[PDB]
Symmetry: C3
Subunit: 335 residues, 3 copies
């Protein structure tokens, strides 16, 4: 019985961080309490000033990542402030019943609700808004994130051997559908509701205008690059709630990857590129062996390099000449 159990309250953090948590744990099941507040807002999504009439959990794209253990109960208070215009709810793919919790969390502006469900299945799972009759629009406008349910005894390799990460990052990839006017410039809308009709028309073409990590072209670059150091193992959580993507770490690999994102299945090793089905979250472990600036991108290189689906990881440490060595630098072709 769930009412029997100890409760615990978690404080969420903004992507690309993930809130402090234990992997393998000696603790027994808890009721883990979270709160998220919906925020609609206009966001600038590229370096040319294009804006999106966006919708978010907790003010970020993606929403924050929620972490529990298998056998825990997730208890979410979802708040829809009166400063928003639309009704919202939440569908946890990690949950069983009631359209993922959507039927039990319909919240008009000025309302809130509390849902509990048992996290009985391990993996990274998408959660997203799913209001009746306007599902894709809320999703593509930014309302998704990841619930990670860790096995109580931590991650395992195909032979049952223990795996771990030293640091976790969460990347949400968003296919955006920004309309254009007769002058071929992207439209800027005064309200969310005004964007709707034109946006549906772009959606129906199936061609995103932009595809971005974490809300903006260049979100995970420069000062906001991810960081690591040689010897450290990183977990890269990648969610795409609406469209397929193909993550790749340039100069690296997926050492162990659950591309379907479900930790009771054996991971695959040595991946160059993996696949996140639209409507899922996946997870890759990599232990850094070389220092330098890596790119982490969607390996449809048009989607990455023209449309925005690419970030950076800056990795400290000592170069390893056994792994790779410039034998002869660029120099004239001798004749």
């Amino acid at each position: 019985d769930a009412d029997k159990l100890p409760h615990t309250k978690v404080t969420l953090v903004a992507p690309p961080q993930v809130h402090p948590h234990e992997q393998a744990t000696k603790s027994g099941p808890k009721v883990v309490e979270f709160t998220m507040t919906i925020e609609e807002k206009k966001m600038v999504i590229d370096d040319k000033g294009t804006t999106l009439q966006a919708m978010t959990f907790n003010g970020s794209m993606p929403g924050p990542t929620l972490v529990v253990h298998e056998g825990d109960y997730v208890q979410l208070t979802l708040v829809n402030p009166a400063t928003n215009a639309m009704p919202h709810n939440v569908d946890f793919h990690g949950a069983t019943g009631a359209l993922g919790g959507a039927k039990l969390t319909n919240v008009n502006p000025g309302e809130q609700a509390t849902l509990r469900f048992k996290a009985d299945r391990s993996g990274t799972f998408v959660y997203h808004c799913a209001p009746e009759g306007m599902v894709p629009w809320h999703v593509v406008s930014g309302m998704s994130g990841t619930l990670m349910v860790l096995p109580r005894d931590g991650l395992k390799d195909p032979q049952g051997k223990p795996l771990h990460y030293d640091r976790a990052y969460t990347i949400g990839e968003f296919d955006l559908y920004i309309p254009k006017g007769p002058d071929g410039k992207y439209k800027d809308y005064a309200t969310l509701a005004e964007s709707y009709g034109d946006t549906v028309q772009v959606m129906r073409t199936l061609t995103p205008s932009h595809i971005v990590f974490n809300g903006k072209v260049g979100a995970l670059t420069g000062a906001n690059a991810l960081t690591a150091k040689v010897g450290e193992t990183v977990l890269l959580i990648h969610s795409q709630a609406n469209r397929d993507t193909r993550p790749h770490l340039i100069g690296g690999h997926g050492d162990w990857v659950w591309e379907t994102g479900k930790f009771a299945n054996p991971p695959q090793r040595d991946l160059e590129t993996w696949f996140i089905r639209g409507g899922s979250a996946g997870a890759a472990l990599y232990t850094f062996k070389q220092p330098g600036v890596y790119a982490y991108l969607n390996h449809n290189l048009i989607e990455a390099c023209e449309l925005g689906a690419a970030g950076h990881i800056k990795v400290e440490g000592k170069w390893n000449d056994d792994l790779m060595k410039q034998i002869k630098a660029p120099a004239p072709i001798p004749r």
Copy 2:
């Protein structure tokens, strides 16, 4: 030798049902006899009256599902009535040789042919029409279905433990390419042959106008929803003969999934969303734990919700508060 074996005749049923059959079986190999009759016809595919000049096996999209066991021989009589206009044939992906049987089953209107092949490989396999020089058109116009070849000892989990379904449903997902006229309205054609040229032009854009389960937007909804009850295990066969899709059961999971559809491989568990490669059939088992109306859809939510790739499953039984509970219903945000 195949001429040695007992024959048996199977009566096919219309999707989304699958004809009566045994899973694990003590019977030895049989020659399993089927017949299908091709039917070209105009079909209404959406709620706005749009029509498709369609082509079908047995009058339905998809064609009916054929079920045998590994080691059986499939023996198909394919009939192309003189009331049709085009030549047809059939390519079984479950078969070895002769372009899947296409080279041996070329049938002009008024002809028929009988093919036999050995079902030596277990899984769900696409079959489709493949007339020389007009393959994609026949496929996208509706000519595909699934052959399911069960292992003689039934389905197995990754550890070799037995799995079963209590009920099987078959869903064919069809990317349709319906042309539009200068007024932006979909074209209605008096004959199949008249649709061809304009349809090729839409196909070459790679953008479907509609994407539908089982022939029509809303095919598997309302009175035609799929049904189950709590405690029952269902097999959801999903075929897509031309384009990738990503099945998802909202409020449920794929308990055991063979997304590539081949039962000698271990299934994956706990999937939120799986992937059916264009040109394949996949299969998922789920045991219902909560009652209610579920959506089964392609989790590109534009393809599902705007373009049509979505159906419903109405599930009887008792709600389970341990799995999920509304702790606090939607209600004003206290201040």
Copy 3:
């Protein structure tokens, strides 16, 4: 230490062949030396005379396949002749560090460089050009190929049993983005640099104009069909450096397939259709059981049959009536 090891020089061959090599080997690690020379050139890519301002490794699309064993070191001399116009480099997905070697191999026309890296991970891996700020264009214009790193003890099935191929073929699949002028005809450009701007615009639509194996519609057909005979096992290496594809052998199967392409993972068996993520190379084994002309294609049948992603394999040997038999040839429907 790598400087300790014996060196060996490999002579490359043009696709669809793969250079002579050993699978399981008693030899210890070597430094394997290769050379490739970049060639920019206009190529005719279809039967209607359309041209592409192409970029290639070694004059072919794809580049040639390089084969080593796990634990070897690849040592590549990359040469960019002064007759080319653009700078180039190379990113080996099989390598660790420095953006796959791209940062250490930047070569302007008239220069060359030599890179070494350790092939410490088994599988087929894409390599491609990745010049800063123009990555997708170089890739989609033809600059990719496969590095195959075999396990030292050869390929293995899921139970550790030995697998082999008798013959290997390499297929690169290229999504091309050829611009059109106001008359709706494809543009022919006098130089590579002149194609750039218009090509970017087509790329951003995400809709290829052509999708081809090995550089041209029909590249692997007629006199250039692949060949096999009944009883022979073939390895079909399939690379796609930019876009997803779904290989299928019509009338055959993937007997053992590593669709993610990484040989330390167990292969899947009996596949009808497999999936190569954009940015990866995959590998399938098939042992031929029937003679005849097979099609090997991308099973989005529009991409294959309208856009070009399809070739042929002509297989010698004796027909097998147990596997498949025409019981009754096409003939009038009796009444």
